[PDB]
Structures are given as C-alpha cells and as structure tokens.
A paper describes a structure:
ChtII is a GH18 chitinase and possesses the greatest number of catalytic domains and chitin-binding domains in this family. Here we report the catalytic properties and the crystal structures of the catalytic domains of OfChtII, the ChtII derived from the Asian corn borer O. furnacalis. Analyzing the domain structure of the predicted protein with the SMART tool revealed that OfChtII contains five GH18 domains and seven CBM14-type chitin-binding modules (CBMs). The other two GH18 domains (C1 and C2) are predicted to be catalytically active (CAD).
The crystal of OfChtII-C1 was obtained by vapor diffusion, and the structure was determined using X-ray diffraction data at a resolution of 1.78 Å. The crystal belonged to space group P41212, and each asymmetric unit contained a single molecule. According to the structural characteristics, OfChtII-C1 could be divided into two distinct domains: a core domain and an insertion domain (CID). The core domain (residues 1613–1855 and 1940–1988, where the amino acid residues are numbered based on the full-length protein) is a classic (β/α)8 barrel with eight β-strands (β1–β8) tethered by eight α-helices (α1–α8). The CID (residues 1856–1939), which is composed of six antiparallel β-strands flanked by two short α-helices, is located between β7 and α7. The catalytic signature motif of GH18 chitinases, DXDXE (Asp1729–Glu1733), is located between β4 and α4. A long substrate-binding cleft, which comprises a series of conservative aromatic residues (Trp1621, Tyr1624, Trp1663, Trp1691, Trp1809, and Trp1961), is observed on the surface of OfChtII-C1. A conserved tryptophan on the surface of OfChtII-C1 was rotated 28.3° closer to the catalytic residue Glu1733 compared with the corresponding residue in OfChtII-C2, which could make the substrate more accessible to the catalytic residues. SmChiC lacks the α+β insertion domain, which is responsible for forming one “wall” of the substrate-binding cleft of OfChtII-C1.
Author numbering: 1606 to 1868, 1879 to 1992
C-alpha cells in the first residue's frame, strides 16, 4: 500500500475530463484510490473580486464534484484543491493579487474558509507563472517573485495551524525558476513542490521533440531541458529532496511534421498534431489515444536504447512523443535514487484507466506504484 510507503504519489484530477465522449468520459467515481496518496483537484480560479472561486459551477457545485472527490479522504488519501492552471494564468490577475498586500490578506482568509467549507485537506498553487506569465518573462514585474513568496508565507501561516496542506506545482524551466521563484522560501514552507517535469517540447518548437526527457540527449539545443537537470537545479537552489515530487506525463505532445520524408527527433513541424477523438486538443493526445494508434492503426514506435527519454510514434505526417511503462519505471528508479519525496502524474483521466489497450487498467500509474513500492534501486 502506498499509504505505508516512504513516497508520495500525487494524482491530478481534472473536472473537465467529464466532458468527453464514450470511454474518454471521466467522473469522480472513476478515481482508483489504491493508486494515489494525494489527489489534487484542478482547478479553482481567481475571481474578478480577487477571491478563489469555482471555475465550473455546473460540475463543482451543481453536480457536487468537490464533494465527490473529497469523498476519497475516507481511504486515507489527502485531497487538495488546486488554484490556477495554465488557462487561468493568461493575464495579470495573479500578479495584481500578489503585489497588493491588502488583496493578499483578504484572499488568504477567504481561501481557507473555502477549503474548510468543502472539506479539502489543503491548497495547491498552480500559477504559471510568477513573473513569467505563461512562460513569458517579459510580461511580469520582478516583484512577482517576492509577492508570490509572501503569498505562500501568508497562506502557510493560516493553513498550517489548522493542519491543512500547502503545495505548489512549479516550472521545470531554469529561466522561469530564476525569474519567478524564491526557492529557499518555497522549499521551507511548502509541504511539497510538484515539479512539472514535462512539456519540455511541443508544437511551439516548430520541430519534433520529446514531451519529457529524463537525461540529456546529444541533439538537444540546451543542456537543461531534461528532468535530471531540472530536479538537480531545484536542489541546488536550496530545495531538500523530501519536498520534491517529480511530475510524469500520462499524455503525449503531438506534431504535424513537414513533408520531407524523415521521422526522427528535431525534424521540421508545421503545426500541432491532429486532435484526438476524446481529448479534442491539437498538439495533445492522452496515453489511451496513443496506445490505440500503435496497437490498431499501425503507428511505428521508436524507443531510446539508452533510455534517456520515452518513445515516440508516427504515421504519415503525424508524430507524438510520450512516456511508456519502461521509461516510467526508469523515472521512478531515478526518484528513488535521489530520495525524492515521490512522484506526481498529469493526469488521472489520461492514463488507460479503462484497459482499452490490453495492458491492464491504469498501466502507467500502476507502473509508478509498483516501482515506488519496490525496495530495489
Ligand atoms: C544528471 O545531472 C547531474 C547534475 O546536473 C549530472 O551530474 C549527471 O551527469 C546527469 N546524469 C546523466 C546526464 O545521466
């Protein structure tokens, strides 16, 4: 059992996975509580009044999704609510909040009342990102760093005496870490730091690349776009290993490659990949969409014999990089070897929870749990 282990397994739940057809539909009752130590609910958002509020009132309130996920506390799981996410981070509202001490003071008392009203065990901060709004460091003021650090302190001061948790999902990008994070403050105050060691590469690069490399690859344009660099950088900046939980993607980044008759890494790309039937997002495919293309649509799979990264798969002008069970076990061994706090997944609803691909239900997440519980490194 994971609840008896020395590691966390932090599972993100997404309320919008409900709005998918057929086998892609995901509900709170689909959560498998044997596979997580912590569940984080994505997402609440920052309202126009500077107060945390439900993003989807139809699901979160009218259909009681908050209560139906907090349900899983009865199994010994810690259930947190996440604030923010990529879409909520587009503008300046988080910046406006953290640069105004009076706005922070009002937000903090309301936020803890919000958590206690619905029974949440904690708050997860997912601002992407302080200073570098949606990764553009030219947008925000440097004071976002001190503002966010002070917000974390002020939340911790109210949450911790109540026994409530405080965590944050953070950038894997050296640039963002340098510009937006006061790492020693975050490392001291947060119960864990969920490092989003994925989306290193995607359609925005205009060439193919892996969503979540583990180690440096010779063809990389940087030394630092891999999980091994990222995790060591967080520690070098002052983060104890026990506070770090390493993110792992249950999905792939997809590409429409240019017509040049090649299919490897770093080949020119004209657009994101065609949307999947269930996830409906150009450039994105759930694992259960990827594994069906391999099994039943003849996509060719290319694996790294050195295991610096997971596989990629392609057919025609479509190309996708993702993590398979093999590289997942490698990443979890990495986690154990550095004595990190554990692992994190994005997201529950993107793994093959229905056993559509015949490897068993939740093949990626079960691979993580099995390897976390295996004493051998
Ligand atoms: C992982 O990163 C560490 C610290 O940056 C480095 O010493 C080591 O060479 C890396 N491991 C690889 C590339 O396999």
């Amino acid at each position: 059992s994971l609840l008896n282990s020395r590691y966390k397994l932090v599972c993100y739940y997404t309320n919008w996975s409900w709005y998918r057809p057929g086998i892609g539909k995901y509900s709170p009752e689909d959560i498998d509580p044997s596979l997580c130590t912590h569940i984080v609910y994505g997402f609440a958002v920052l309202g126009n009044d500077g107060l945390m509020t439900a993003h989807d009132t139809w699901s979160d309130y009218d259909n009681r999704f908050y209560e139906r996920v907090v349900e899983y506390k009865r199994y010994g799981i810690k259930v947190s609510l996440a604030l923010g996410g990529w879409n909520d981070s587009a503008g300046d509202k988080y910046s406006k909040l953290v640069n105004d001490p009076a706005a922070r003071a009002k937000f903090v008392q309301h936020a803890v009342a919000f958590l206690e009203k619905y029974g949440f065990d904690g708050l997860d901060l997912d601002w992407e990102y302080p200073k570098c709004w949606q990764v553009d460091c030219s947008k925000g003021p440097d004071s976002d760093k001190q503002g966010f650090a002070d917000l974390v302190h002020e939340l911790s001061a109210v949450l911790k005496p109540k026994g409530l948790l405080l965590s944050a999902a953070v950038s894997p990008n050296k640039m963002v870490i340098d510009a937006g994070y006061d790492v020693p403050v975050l490392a001291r105050l947060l119960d864990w730091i969920a490092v989003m060691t994925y989306d290193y590469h995607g359609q925005w690069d205009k060439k193919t690349g892996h969503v979540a490399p583990l180690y440096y690859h010779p063809d990389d344009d940087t030394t630092y776009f891999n999980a091994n660099y990222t995790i060591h950088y967080w520690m070098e900046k002052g983060t104890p290993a026990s506070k770090i939980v390493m993110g792992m993607p249950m999905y792939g980044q997809s590409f429409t490659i240019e017509n040049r008759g090649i299919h490897g890494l770093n080949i020119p790309v004209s657009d994101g990949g065609e949307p999947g039937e269930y996830t409906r997002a150009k450039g994105f495919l759930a694992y259960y969409e990827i594994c069906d293309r391999i099994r039943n649509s003849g996509w060719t799979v290319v694996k790294d014999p050195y295991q610096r990264m997971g596989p990629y798969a392609y057919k025609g002008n479509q190309w996708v990089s993702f993590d398979d069970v093999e590289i997942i076990k490698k990443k979890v061994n990495f986690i154990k070897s550095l004595n990190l706090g554990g692992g994190m997944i994005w997201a529950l609803d993107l793994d093959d929870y229905r056993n559509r691909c015949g490897q068993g239900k939740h093949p990626l997440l079960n691979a993580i749990k099995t390897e976390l519980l295996n004493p051998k490194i």
